[PDB]
Amino acid sequence: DRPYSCDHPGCDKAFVRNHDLIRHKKSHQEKA
Numbered sequence: 822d823r824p825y826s827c828d829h830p831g832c833d834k835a836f837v838r839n840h841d842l843i844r845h846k847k848s849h850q851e852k853a
């Protein structure tokens with residue numbers, strides 16, 4: 822049931838694994 826469904830504003834990428842959410846969540850940050 823998508824144990825990793827990030828819910829960040831402007832998001833649109835579901836996940837099933839864990840690390841993915843970790844490498845994906847840190848993306849909502851980015852520099853600049």
Ligand SMILES: [Zn+2]
Pocket residue numbers: 827828829832833834845846849
């Ligand atoms: Zn996200």
